[PDB]
Design a protein around this nucleic acid. Sequence first.
RNA 1: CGUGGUUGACACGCAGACCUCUUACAAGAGUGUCUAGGUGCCUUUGAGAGUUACUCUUUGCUCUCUUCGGAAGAACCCUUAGGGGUUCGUGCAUGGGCUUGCAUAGCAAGUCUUAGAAUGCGGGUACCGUACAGUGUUGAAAAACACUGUAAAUCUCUAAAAGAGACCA
Lengths: 348, 348
Amino acid sequence: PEEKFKIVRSVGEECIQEDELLNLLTKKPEPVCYDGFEPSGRMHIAQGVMKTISVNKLTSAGCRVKIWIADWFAKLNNKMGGDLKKIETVGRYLIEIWKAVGMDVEGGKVEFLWSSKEINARADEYWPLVLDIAQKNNLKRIIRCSQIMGRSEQDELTAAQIFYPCMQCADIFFLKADICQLGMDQRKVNVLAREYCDDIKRKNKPIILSHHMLPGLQQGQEKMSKSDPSSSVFMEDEEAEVNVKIKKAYCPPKVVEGNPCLEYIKYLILPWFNEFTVERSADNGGNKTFKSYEELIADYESGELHPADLKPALSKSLNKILEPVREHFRKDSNAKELLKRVKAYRVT
Amino acid sequence: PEEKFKIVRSVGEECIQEDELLNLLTKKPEPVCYDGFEPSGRMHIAQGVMKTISVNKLTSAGCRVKIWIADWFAKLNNKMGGDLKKIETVGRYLIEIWKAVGMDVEGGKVEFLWSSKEINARADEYWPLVLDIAQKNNLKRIIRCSQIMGRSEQDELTAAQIFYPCMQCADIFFLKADICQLGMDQRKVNVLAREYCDDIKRKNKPIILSHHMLPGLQQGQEKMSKSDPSSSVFMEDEEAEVNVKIKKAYCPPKVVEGNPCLEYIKYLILPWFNEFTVERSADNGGNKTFKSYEELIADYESGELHPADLKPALSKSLNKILEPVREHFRKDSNAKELLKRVKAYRVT
RNA sequence: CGUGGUUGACACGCAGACCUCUUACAAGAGUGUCUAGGUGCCUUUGAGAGUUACUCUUUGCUCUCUUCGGAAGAACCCUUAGGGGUUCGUGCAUGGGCUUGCAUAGCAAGUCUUAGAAUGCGGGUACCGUACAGUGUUGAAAAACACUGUAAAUCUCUAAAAGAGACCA
């Protein structure tokens, strides 16, 4: 009904043709949305938790979700070298993260799909699609759509940088994915898919749900920073590491925009616990719970929410979120082996 | 061994790593030979005659020639609108030409492999190799490999132009190919495959055996252009068409450099009949048979051989060469339908 | 290509095209044949998102609603069908006088006739004619008739371009 649109649209901060989203929800009972991941080692906090809450919201409406875990795409991005077995291991690490935190696996309605497996299974239907998308486009469009890897950087042009966007755009139609829920970076390949769908004269163009970019822990880079372990926070970071990283995290008081701590709160813990408690002394306002981001930012502007006590509360909340994962690795031996391997590898 | 090297080197104008070719013949008694064709437009006299004599000499010397029908590749070049069905009909019509002319298919040493029936059968180890050749190369090197499609760097780029060289360089290894016969048009791909073998430290570097492509029948055209059917001879042309084309051909008196007729003779008739019988009247020397190119070129430089009689003899020889194709097309209703379907298609 | 002349042709010369020869296309010559079109009708509504990307202006491109409908028309379905429904299939500028710049009546400043379709050019469109491609029939070759198309068939075949500031106009 209207509830499906009212909860689905909340997942993506920006969407195009939301009327098409409503039409899709009304026409189809089980829409299919995907998510693309390059297994670049240890998991980012954004992909870990923001994606988890987003997919929980989407499956609350019953929308089918497919995990488009992308190994050959990681090879194109040249993450952890050109090797494939290590990429497969870190990919199954990501799957174990999904199961350990608890995402939707209890229902089994989600689908973890390896790019290699699905592409090889239906190559005759996938690769001709890739070639068609390539033919319908030129180098200028694909080079424009290069930020999806993040390797554009006004750097040396690469053939992988050209095979990437077409190959990703093929995934949308290959998975019969009618809902695209990805980061702001993937919006370029989503727009490319829309243009190609217009060119192929096929209606029901897939809708895009671009959720907000999660800032790094420190000022200097608004987008994701997976090249600096200090600048981001990960799932296998221990309690002491998480706490010290958040204490070192940038957080200027009397600031609304550009504060990574507030963004982490709003996009991670408020949708998770449906609330947020801040512990303070009897002279600083005492322990207080918050139910909305608006009141939290209003009190932060008021100054009663000092960062010096906000960051410990944020650390406690994130530790509460991530402790089921850590307990899962101390119970599962396979999880222990995977963590040992993925910690052994170095990001290159 | 030595005779095999002599025969195989006799067909290619340029041969890189001749010693490696000799070693390959010494070890492998039936080295595999690769040559590709995008089924686009109508067969030129080159791909019909030089390829026929090349395959004949290679099989007689002992080889296993793997010929490629590039159906998907033609779709990338935007040939005949990219319809796979239109490309397929042109492929089986080409196969009919090749069987008519004298391909030694009876020995079983020639296999007509179509890209679609082969890539779909093995895409789990072909496409990943395409991704590998993608990563190992940068975009600028691929752009330098643009003479392959006939698109100059001034001409607007296209993602098909980046997909194409990567897939065919991948073909050079996917077919387990050892020999590439394709002429100066494919030299960029040849050297790129060699440099990739250097990058992937391959121990079997493929040999380059580029043919000499015929100069166009116009002024300054070093290769025939199918976009202008008046500058090339086609395999299915009728005796009147061949005769008028040769009559309108260019052949300056007592000049060898850039003479299309001399190249036609050298690469088509002398390798075919082991001679070139020219019938002349008693006023200018009477009938004369040439057993080698050297005597013919010496006579031409002397001026005693006049193009006025050279051209009709060339026309008669070409008609004798091409009459099996016409007979095969006329005798078979299926061949007739294929021929009329091919001509029906317009030049793109 | 006109004139004696029915589009087209024929007397006549030339124009172009096709063919042959001197075979190098070039340059010239030869005796040949052909050239095509006509008719009738429509064609200016806006907004919106994406699209150079760093924005803004001029825009161009698809693009979904909406429209005095992207029409005159083509395709299909219902089909007692007189009719109805769906899809494809759309043009760009200028104008003429009223008050002024101007001697009130060129061009511009305020409206104007959805477009006087008013003015020119252009899109496809339906029909006829000619020839050709192909098919069948009447067929002794030849020829005649009917039908499907061609003539008027292809460059952002790959939608982004210009400018002005910012960091790159």
